[PDB]
Design a protein around this ligand. Structure first.
Ligand SMILES: NC(=[NH2+])SCc1ccc(Cl)cc1
Ligand SMILES: NC(=[NH2+])SCc1ccc(Cl)cc1
Lengths: 16, 348
Protein backbone atom coordinates (compact mmCIF):
# COMPACT_ATOMS: atom_id res chain seq x y z
CA UNK A 1 0.00 0.00 0.00
CA UNK A 2 3.10 2.21 -0.27
CA UNK A 3 3.44 4.50 -3.28
CA UNK A 4 4.43 7.99 -4.37
CA UNK A 5 2.22 10.62 -2.74
CA UNK A 6 3.93 13.81 -3.97
CA UNK A 7 3.93 15.46 -7.37
CA UNK A 8 5.03 13.05 -10.09
CA UNK A 9 7.60 14.07 -12.68
CA UNK A 10 7.01 12.98 -16.23
CA UNK A 11 9.63 10.98 -18.16
CA UNK A 12 10.67 12.20 -21.60
CA UNK A 13 12.65 9.35 -23.20
CA UNK A 14 13.84 6.70 -20.70
CA UNK A 15 11.51 4.59 -18.56
CA UNK A 16 13.84 3.67 -15.69
CA UNK B 1 -32.22 0.32 -22.42
CA UNK B 2 -33.48 3.46 -24.17
CA UNK B 3 -37.13 4.08 -25.00
CA UNK B 4 -37.53 8.65 -27.94
CA UNK B 5 -34.54 8.92 -25.62
CA UNK B 6 -32.57 7.24 -28.41
CA UNK B 7 -33.66 9.82 -30.98
CA UNK B 8 -32.43 12.60 -28.69
CA UNK B 9 -29.06 10.86 -28.32
CA UNK B 10 -28.75 10.29 -32.08
CA UNK B 11 -29.45 13.93 -32.90
CA UNK B 12 -26.95 14.87 -30.18
CA UNK B 13 -24.38 12.70 -31.93
CA UNK B 14 -24.92 14.37 -35.31
CA UNK B 15 -24.49 17.73 -33.56
CA UNK B 16 -21.16 16.53 -32.15
CA UNK B 17 -20.01 15.65 -35.68
CA UNK B 18 -21.06 19.12 -36.86
CA UNK B 19 -19.20 20.84 -34.01
CA UNK B 20 -16.02 18.82 -34.51
CA UNK B 21 -16.05 19.57 -38.25
CA UNK B 22 -16.13 23.32 -37.61
CA UNK B 23 -13.57 22.95 -34.81
CA UNK B 24 -11.16 21.20 -37.19
CA UNK B 25 -11.57 23.97 -39.77
CA UNK B 26 -10.71 26.61 -37.15
CA UNK B 27 -7.77 24.59 -35.83
CA UNK B 28 -6.19 24.01 -39.24
CA UNK B 29 -6.28 27.71 -40.11
CA UNK B 30 -4.25 28.43 -36.97
CA UNK B 31 -2.10 25.30 -37.27
CA UNK B 32 -0.83 26.24 -40.75
CA UNK B 33 -0.48 30.00 -40.05
CA UNK B 34 0.91 30.56 -36.53
CA UNK B 35 7.49 36.96 -30.47
CA UNK B 36 4.26 38.44 -29.08
CA UNK B 37 6.18 40.04 -26.13
CA UNK B 38 9.49 40.27 -24.24
CA UNK B 39 10.59 39.50 -20.70
CA UNK B 40 10.93 43.08 -19.44
CA UNK B 41 7.21 43.62 -20.11
CA UNK B 42 6.49 41.59 -16.95
CA UNK B 43 7.26 41.64 -13.24
CA UNK B 44 8.17 38.37 -11.54
CA UNK B 45 5.76 37.52 -8.70
CA UNK B 46 6.08 33.87 -7.63
CA UNK B 47 7.02 30.37 -8.77
CA UNK B 48 3.87 28.29 -9.29
CA UNK B 49 5.47 24.96 -10.25
CA UNK B 50 8.80 23.36 -11.21
CA UNK B 51 10.03 20.54 -13.43
CA UNK B 52 13.26 19.14 -14.83
CA UNK B 53 13.65 21.62 -17.70
CA UNK B 54 9.36 26.36 -14.29
CA UNK B 55 5.99 28.15 -14.38
CA UNK B 56 6.00 31.64 -12.87
CA UNK B 57 3.21 33.98 -11.92
CA UNK B 58 3.96 37.28 -13.66
CA UNK B 59 2.29 40.68 -13.92
CA UNK B 60 2.16 42.48 -17.26
CA UNK B 61 3.55 45.94 -16.52
CA UNK B 62 1.46 47.85 -19.06
CA UNK B 63 -1.99 46.34 -18.45
CA UNK B 64 -1.48 44.99 -14.92
CA UNK B 65 -2.98 41.63 -15.88
CA UNK B 66 -1.64 38.45 -14.31
CA UNK B 67 -0.39 35.47 -16.31
CA UNK B 68 1.35 32.14 -15.80
CA UNK B 69 4.70 32.18 -17.61
CA UNK B 70 6.34 28.85 -18.41
CA UNK B 71 10.12 29.29 -18.77
CA UNK B 72 12.24 26.71 -20.62
CA UNK B 73 16.04 26.81 -20.56
CA UNK B 74 17.03 26.40 -24.21
CA UNK B 75 20.26 24.55 -23.43
CA UNK B 76 18.51 22.31 -20.90
CA UNK B 77 15.93 21.30 -23.55
CA UNK B 78 18.27 18.60 -24.78
CA UNK B 79 17.44 16.15 -23.25
CA UNK B 80 16.68 15.36 -26.94
CA UNK B 81 12.90 14.59 -27.13
CA UNK B 82 12.58 17.83 -25.19
CA UNK B 83 13.41 19.80 -28.36
CA UNK B 84 10.62 18.45 -30.59
CA UNK B 85 8.25 18.28 -27.61
CA UNK B 86 8.70 21.99 -26.83
CA UNK B 87 7.84 22.85 -30.43
CA UNK B 88 4.81 20.56 -30.27
CA UNK B 89 3.58 22.37 -27.16
CA UNK B 90 3.75 25.90 -28.57
CA UNK B 91 2.26 25.10 -31.97
CA UNK B 92 -0.59 23.08 -30.46
CA UNK B 93 -1.49 25.61 -27.76
CA UNK B 94 -1.60 28.47 -30.26
CA UNK B 95 -4.06 26.59 -32.51
CA UNK B 96 -6.54 24.90 -30.13
CA UNK B 97 -9.63 26.48 -28.60
CA UNK B 98 -11.80 24.65 -26.05
CA UNK B 99 -13.42 25.66 -22.73
CA UNK B 100 -11.26 23.31 -20.62
CA UNK B 101 -7.86 24.09 -22.16
CA UNK B 102 -5.69 26.85 -20.76
CA UNK B 103 -5.28 29.65 -23.29
CA UNK B 104 -1.86 30.72 -24.53
CA UNK B 105 -1.60 34.52 -24.70
CA UNK B 106 1.98 35.26 -25.83
CA UNK B 107 5.14 33.36 -26.65
CA UNK B 108 8.69 34.54 -27.26
CA UNK B 109 12.32 33.57 -26.78
CA UNK B 110 15.60 35.25 -25.86
CA UNK B 111 19.27 34.28 -25.70
CA UNK B 112 18.73 31.69 -22.96
CA UNK B 113 15.06 30.71 -22.60
CA UNK B 114 11.76 30.00 -24.29
CA UNK B 115 8.66 31.65 -22.82
CA UNK B 116 4.99 30.71 -23.03
CA UNK B 117 2.58 33.11 -21.33
CA UNK B 118 -0.78 31.57 -20.44
CA UNK B 119 -3.94 32.72 -18.71
CA UNK B 120 -3.51 32.49 -14.95
CA UNK B 121 -5.89 30.00 -13.33
CA UNK B 122 -5.82 30.89 -9.61
CA UNK B 123 -7.83 27.98 -8.18
CA UNK B 124 -4.81 25.68 -7.92
CA UNK B 125 -4.06 22.18 -9.16
CA UNK B 126 -6.58 19.40 -8.67
CA UNK B 127 -3.62 17.51 -7.24
CA UNK B 128 -3.33 19.57 -4.07
CA UNK B 129 -7.09 19.71 -3.46
CA UNK B 130 -7.29 15.94 -3.90
CA UNK B 131 -4.38 15.20 -1.55
CA UNK B 132 -5.87 17.58 1.02
CA UNK B 133 -9.42 16.17 0.97
CA UNK B 134 -8.27 12.58 0.40
CA UNK B 135 -10.73 11.52 -2.28
CA UNK B 136 -13.64 12.93 -4.24
CA UNK B 137 -17.18 11.58 -4.15
CA UNK B 138 -18.24 9.78 -7.32
CA UNK B 139 -20.48 12.70 -8.43
CA UNK B 140 -17.56 15.07 -7.80
CA UNK B 141 -15.11 12.92 -9.77
CA UNK B 142 -17.73 12.40 -12.49
CA UNK B 143 -18.02 16.17 -12.97
CA UNK B 144 -14.28 16.46 -13.60
CA UNK B 145 -14.11 13.26 -15.66
CA UNK B 146 -16.83 14.51 -18.02
CA UNK B 147 -14.74 17.58 -18.87
CA UNK B 148 -11.72 15.41 -19.65
CA UNK B 149 -13.85 13.13 -21.84
CA UNK B 150 -15.03 16.10 -23.87
CA UNK B 151 -11.54 17.60 -24.04
CA UNK B 152 -10.07 14.35 -25.38
CA UNK B 153 -12.95 14.01 -27.84
CA UNK B 154 -11.99 17.47 -29.10
CA UNK B 155 -8.23 16.85 -29.14
CA UNK B 156 -8.44 13.39 -30.73
CA UNK B 157 -10.71 14.70 -33.51
CA UNK B 158 -7.81 17.02 -34.45
CA UNK B 159 -5.40 14.04 -34.42
CA UNK B 160 -3.84 15.33 -31.18
CA UNK B 161 -2.77 13.00 -28.38
CA UNK B 162 -2.28 14.59 -24.96
CA UNK B 163 -0.10 11.98 -23.18
CA UNK B 164 0.30 13.50 -19.69
CA UNK B 165 -3.08 13.37 -17.98
CA UNK B 166 -2.78 13.56 -14.19
CA UNK B 167 -4.17 15.75 -11.37
CA UNK B 168 -0.96 17.82 -11.37
CA UNK B 169 -1.91 19.12 -14.85
CA UNK B 170 -5.57 19.96 -14.11
CA UNK B 171 -6.22 23.46 -12.78
CA UNK B 172 -9.48 24.53 -11.17
CA UNK B 173 -10.82 27.82 -12.47
CA UNK B 174 -12.93 30.46 -10.76
CA UNK B 175 -16.15 28.63 -11.69
CA UNK B 176 -14.87 25.28 -10.40
CA UNK B 177 -14.25 23.88 -13.90
CA UNK B 178 -11.08 22.24 -15.23
CA UNK B 179 -8.37 23.88 -17.29
CA UNK B 180 -5.86 21.40 -18.75
CA UNK B 181 -2.32 22.76 -18.74
CA UNK B 182 1.09 21.53 -19.87
CA UNK B 183 1.02 20.35 -23.49
CA UNK B 184 4.70 19.38 -23.40
CA UNK B 185 3.93 15.83 -24.53
CA UNK B 186 0.99 16.62 -26.78
CA UNK B 187 1.55 15.62 -30.39
CA UNK B 188 -0.29 15.60 -33.69
CA UNK B 189 -0.41 11.92 -34.69
CA UNK B 190 -2.36 10.56 -37.66
CA UNK B 191 -1.76 6.90 -36.78
CA UNK B 192 0.84 5.59 -34.34
CA UNK B 193 3.74 7.17 -32.49
CA UNK B 194 6.69 5.66 -30.63
CA UNK B 195 8.21 8.05 -28.05
CA UNK B 196 8.53 6.56 -24.58
CA UNK B 197 7.10 9.41 -22.52
CA UNK B 198 4.54 10.30 -19.87
CA UNK B 199 4.24 9.89 -16.13
CA UNK B 200 4.83 6.37 -14.77
CA UNK B 201 1.57 5.87 -12.84
CA UNK B 202 -0.43 6.97 -15.91
CA UNK B 203 1.40 5.08 -18.68
CA UNK B 204 -0.62 2.64 -20.75
CA UNK B 205 0.91 -0.86 -21.01
CA UNK B 206 1.69 -0.47 -24.70
CA UNK B 207 3.93 2.54 -23.97
CA UNK B 208 5.81 0.57 -21.32
CA UNK B 209 6.22 -2.36 -23.70
CA UNK B 210 7.82 -0.11 -26.37
CA UNK B 211 4.97 -0.74 -28.81
CA UNK B 212 3.84 1.84 -31.32
CA UNK B 213 0.71 3.34 -29.80
CA UNK B 214 -2.14 5.72 -30.55
CA UNK B 215 -4.72 7.96 -28.87
CA UNK B 216 -6.05 5.03 -26.81
CA UNK B 217 -3.25 5.74 -24.30
CA UNK B 218 -5.23 8.85 -23.30
CA UNK B 219 -8.31 6.72 -22.55
CA UNK B 220 -6.23 4.39 -20.40
CA UNK B 221 -4.94 7.47 -18.56
CA UNK B 222 -8.52 8.64 -18.04
CA UNK B 223 -9.14 5.35 -16.24
CA UNK B 224 -6.15 6.02 -14.00
CA UNK B 225 -7.37 9.57 -13.34
CA UNK B 226 -10.94 8.57 -12.48
CA UNK B 227 -9.65 5.82 -10.18
CA UNK B 228 -7.26 8.23 -8.42
CA UNK B 229 -9.94 10.91 -8.03
CA UNK B 230 -12.42 8.42 -6.52
CA UNK B 231 -9.95 6.40 -4.40
CA UNK B 232 -7.37 9.03 -3.42
CA UNK B 233 -4.54 6.98 -4.95
CA UNK B 234 -3.89 5.56 -8.43
CA UNK B 235 -4.52 1.91 -9.36
CA UNK B 236 -0.85 1.02 -10.00
CA UNK B 237 0.91 2.31 -6.92
CA UNK B 238 4.49 1.58 -5.81
CA UNK B 239 7.59 3.39 -4.60
CA UNK B 240 9.74 2.84 -7.69
CA UNK B 241 8.82 3.31 -11.38
CA UNK B 242 9.98 -0.23 -12.23
CA UNK B 243 7.48 -1.68 -9.74
CA UNK B 244 4.71 0.52 -11.17
CA UNK B 245 5.43 -0.75 -14.69
CA UNK B 246 5.15 -4.40 -13.61
CA UNK B 247 1.72 -3.79 -12.09
CA UNK B 248 0.49 -1.91 -15.16
CA UNK B 249 1.46 -4.70 -17.56
CA UNK B 250 0.04 -7.49 -15.35
CA UNK B 251 -3.54 -6.71 -16.34
CA UNK B 252 -4.80 -6.78 -12.73
CA UNK B 253 -6.63 -3.96 -10.92
CA UNK B 254 -8.14 -3.97 -7.44
CA UNK B 255 -10.81 -1.49 -6.37
CA UNK B 256 -11.77 0.07 -3.02
CA UNK B 257 -14.84 -1.50 -1.48
CA UNK B 258 -16.64 1.86 -1.63
CA UNK B 259 -16.47 1.99 -5.47
CA UNK B 260 -19.87 1.56 -7.09
CA UNK B 261 -20.26 -1.35 -9.48
CA UNK B 262 -20.95 1.11 -12.30
CA UNK B 263 -17.62 2.81 -11.59
CA UNK B 264 -15.75 -0.50 -11.46
CA UNK B 265 -17.30 -1.59 -14.77
CA UNK B 266 -16.24 1.64 -16.47
CA UNK B 267 -12.72 1.40 -15.07
CA UNK B 268 -12.30 -2.24 -16.11
CA UNK B 269 -13.09 -1.19 -19.68
CA UNK B 270 -10.73 1.82 -19.64
CA UNK B 271 -7.90 0.03 -17.83
CA UNK B 272 -8.06 -2.70 -20.46
CA UNK B 273 -4.70 -4.06 -21.62
CA UNK B 274 -6.28 -5.49 -24.79
CA UNK B 275 -6.62 -2.68 -27.32
CA UNK B 276 -9.36 -4.55 -29.19
CA UNK B 277 -11.47 -4.18 -26.01
CA UNK B 278 -10.51 -0.80 -24.52
CA UNK B 279 -13.30 1.78 -24.33
CA UNK B 280 -12.53 4.76 -26.52
CA UNK B 281 -10.80 2.45 -29.02
CA UNK B 282 -13.82 0.51 -30.37
CA UNK B 283 -16.22 0.97 -33.27
CA UNK B 284 -18.33 3.46 -31.29
CA UNK B 285 -15.28 5.44 -30.16
CA UNK B 286 -15.90 7.91 -27.34
CA UNK B 287 -19.63 7.11 -27.23
CA UNK B 288 -18.91 3.86 -25.38
CA UNK B 289 -17.66 6.12 -22.58
CA UNK B 290 -20.26 8.87 -22.83
CA UNK B 291 -23.13 6.35 -22.88
CA UNK B 292 -21.77 4.25 -20.01
CA UNK B 293 -24.08 3.84 -17.03
CA UNK B 294 -21.69 5.68 -14.70
CA UNK B 295 -22.24 8.80 -16.83
CA UNK B 296 -26.02 8.29 -17.05
CA UNK B 297 -26.70 11.49 -15.06
CA UNK B 298 -24.21 13.54 -17.08
CA UNK B 299 -25.63 16.24 -19.36
CA UNK B 300 -22.75 16.45 -21.83
CA UNK B 301 -23.97 19.63 -23.52
CA UNK B 302 -24.57 21.32 -20.17
CA UNK B 303 -21.03 20.47 -19.07
CA UNK B 304 -19.62 21.94 -22.28
CA UNK B 305 -21.72 25.10 -21.87
CA UNK B 306 -20.61 25.26 -18.21
CA UNK B 307 -24.25 25.22 -17.03
CA UNK B 308 -23.67 22.61 -14.29
CA UNK B 309 -23.08 23.71 -10.70
CA UNK B 310 -19.52 22.82 -9.78
CA UNK B 311 -18.78 20.67 -6.71
CA UNK B 312 -16.27 23.15 -5.33
CA UNK B 313 -15.54 26.84 -6.00
CA UNK B 314 -12.00 27.86 -4.98
CA UNK B 315 -11.73 30.96 -2.81
CA UNK B 316 -10.00 33.90 -4.49
CA UNK B 317 -8.83 36.87 -2.43
CA UNK B 318 -8.19 38.94 -5.55
CA UNK B 319 -6.09 39.27 -8.69
CA UNK B 320 -2.68 37.66 -8.43
CA UNK B 321 -3.71 35.58 -5.42
CA UNK B 322 -1.50 32.51 -5.06
CA UNK B 323 -3.10 31.07 -1.90
CA UNK B 324 -4.30 27.94 -3.75
CA UNK B 325 -0.76 26.93 -4.86
CA UNK B 326 2.05 25.33 -2.88
CA UNK B 327 5.37 27.12 -2.35
CA UNK B 328 8.56 26.42 -4.27
CA UNK B 329 12.18 27.44 -4.09
CA UNK B 330 12.66 30.78 -5.86
CA UNK B 331 15.70 30.35 -8.10
CA UNK B 332 17.35 33.09 -10.13
CA UNK B 333 16.29 33.67 -13.73
CA UNK B 334 19.37 34.62 -15.76
CA UNK B 335 19.67 35.58 -19.43
CA UNK B 336 23.01 35.35 -21.24
CA UNK B 337 24.64 38.07 -23.33
CA UNK B 338 25.16 35.38 -26.00
CA UNK B 339 22.38 33.58 -27.87
CA UNK B 340 22.24 29.86 -27.12
CA UNK B 341 20.86 27.14 -29.41
CA UNK B 342 19.66 29.73 -31.92
CA UNK B 343 19.44 27.39 -34.91
CA UNK B 344 18.07 24.53 -32.79
CA UNK B 345 14.99 26.64 -31.89
CA UNK B 346 14.48 28.67 -35.08
CA UNK B 347 10.86 27.51 -35.41
CA UNK B 348 9.83 28.70 -31.93
N1 LIG C 1 14.09 11.93 -28.28
C1 LIG C 1 13.07 12.02 -29.10
N2 LIG C 1 11.89 11.56 -28.76
S1 LIG C 1 13.27 12.77 -30.66
C2 LIG C 1 14.49 14.11 -30.47
C3 LIG C 1 15.92 13.66 -30.61
C4 LIG C 1 16.95 14.59 -30.62
C5 LIG C 1 18.27 14.19 -30.69
C6 LIG C 1 18.56 12.84 -30.75
CL1 LIG C 1 20.23 12.32 -30.79
C7 LIG C 1 17.56 11.90 -30.76
C8 LIG C 1 16.24 12.32 -30.69
N1 LIG D 1 0.78 22.22 -12.79
C1 LIG D 1 1.69 22.64 -13.63
N2 LIG D 1 1.93 22.00 -14.75
S1 LIG D 1 2.60 24.07 -13.26
C2 LIG D 1 1.51 25.15 -12.27
C3 LIG D 1 0.67 26.08 -13.10
C4 LIG D 1 0.65 25.97 -14.49
C5 LIG D 1 -0.15 26.79 -15.26
C6 LIG D 1 -0.95 27.72 -14.63
CL1 LIG D 1 -2.04 28.69 -15.59
C7 LIG D 1 -0.94 27.87 -13.26
C8 LIG D 1 -0.13 27.04 -12.51
Amino acid sequence: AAGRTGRRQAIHDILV
Amino acid sequence: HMGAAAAKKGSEQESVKEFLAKAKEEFLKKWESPNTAQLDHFDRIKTLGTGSFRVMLVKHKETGNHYAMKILDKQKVVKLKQIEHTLNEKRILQAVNFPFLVKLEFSFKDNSNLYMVMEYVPGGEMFSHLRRIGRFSEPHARFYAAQIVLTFEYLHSLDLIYRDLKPENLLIDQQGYIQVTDFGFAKRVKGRTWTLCGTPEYLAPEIILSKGYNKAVDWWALGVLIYEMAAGYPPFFADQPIQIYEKIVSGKVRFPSHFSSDLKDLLRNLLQVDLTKRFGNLKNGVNDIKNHKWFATTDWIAIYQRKVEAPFIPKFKGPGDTSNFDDYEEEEIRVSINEKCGKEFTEF
